[PDB]
């Protein structure tokens, strides 16, 4: 997306992190994923964390 | 290996209320996609229902959207479909089957 | 809700030849389709999935092909217990079409 709005943007987005594999896999499909946003200033990639919780 | 056993037989009489059964076997009770085929005497093929379980959300047709409510259990990995105000464009064979991925992707199973 | 077209609704079970059944949307779908197989009256079996891959319990006397509007499910050399009505059905769109039926005999 090309800020073509008129004025700075707020933009906001996440990463799930699931319970265990078969959640990763009946989501996704695969495991070792990524997510990767980025911009002129910004640049991240995160690898999610599969792991049982509280 | 994963199967599907359903419910009856028994047809009824218009104006009346179905809530066929299938609970499922052969694996965990999440994946598991839920879908429900029903067939007419002698015609195509109908797709009414379905239910998501990783979700717990559930789609159907709009030729019912008011009538139909799906649901499920996961303790007794049982489906539930409910059709209400029963008529004659509601009379068929009610196959319940396993589907894929939120997107409903290809029914592997079928209940007999 | 996209509307298939299963043309024809039956051609005539002349055994051996190359017997193509067609499956054509309303609109652009891609690779999001499933080819069912209805012996006599009963519970449909799933054989393709996904437009040119096979079920893995499998017949090599099948196949899937297609991508755009257009799809073909292909019998080659027929065999004897393959009597049924068939349908192609959908996702990518949402609330799932089938066909109507292709149908042919001994």
């Known amino acids: 997306y090309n800020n073509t709005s008129g004025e700075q943007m707020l933009i906001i987005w996440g990463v799930h992190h699931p319970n265990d594999e078969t959640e990763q896999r009946t989501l996704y499909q695969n495991v070792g994923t990524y997510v990767s946003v980025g911009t002129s200033t910004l640049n991240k990639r995160s690898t999610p964390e599969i792991a049982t919780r509280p | 290996e994963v199967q599907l056993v359903e419910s009856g037989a028994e047809v009824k009489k218009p104006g009346s209320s179905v809530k066929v059964s299938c609970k499922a076997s052969?694996?965990?009770?999440?994946?598991?996609?839920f879908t429900w085929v029903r067939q007419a005497p002698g015609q195509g093929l109908e797709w009414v229902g379905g239910?998501?379980?990783?979700?717990?959300?559930?789609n159907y047709a709009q030729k019912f959207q008011g009538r139909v409510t799906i649901t499920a259990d996961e303790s007794t990995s049982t489906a539930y479909m409910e059709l209400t105000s029963l008529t004659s464009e509601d009379t068929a064979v009610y196959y319940c089957?396993?589907?894929?991925?939120?997107?409903?992707?290809?029914?592997?199973?079928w209940g007999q | 809700d996209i509307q298939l077209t299963q043309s024809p609704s039956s051609l005539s079970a002349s055994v051996g030849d190359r017997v193509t059944i067609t499956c054509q949307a309303s609109?652009?779908?891609?690779?999001?389709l499933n080819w069912y197989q209805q012996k006599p009256g009963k519970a449909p079996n799933l054989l393709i999935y996904?437009?040119?891959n096979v079920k893995t319990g499998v017949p090599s006397r099948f196949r899937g092909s297609g991508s755009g509007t257009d799809f073909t499910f292909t019998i080659s050399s027929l065999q004897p217990e393959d009597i049924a009505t068939y349908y192609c059905?959908?996702?990518?769109?949402?609330?799932?079409?089938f066909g109507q039926g292709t149908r042919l005999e001994i």
């Open positions: 059905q959908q996702y990518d769109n949402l609330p799932i079409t």
């Open positions: 609109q652009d779908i891609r690779k999001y």
């Open positions: 239910f998501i379980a990783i979700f717990g959300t559930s």
């Open positions: 052969g694996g965990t009770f999440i994946t598991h996609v």
């Open positions: 996904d437009a040119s």
């Open positions: 089957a396993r589907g894929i991925s939120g997107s409903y992707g290809w029914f592997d199973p």
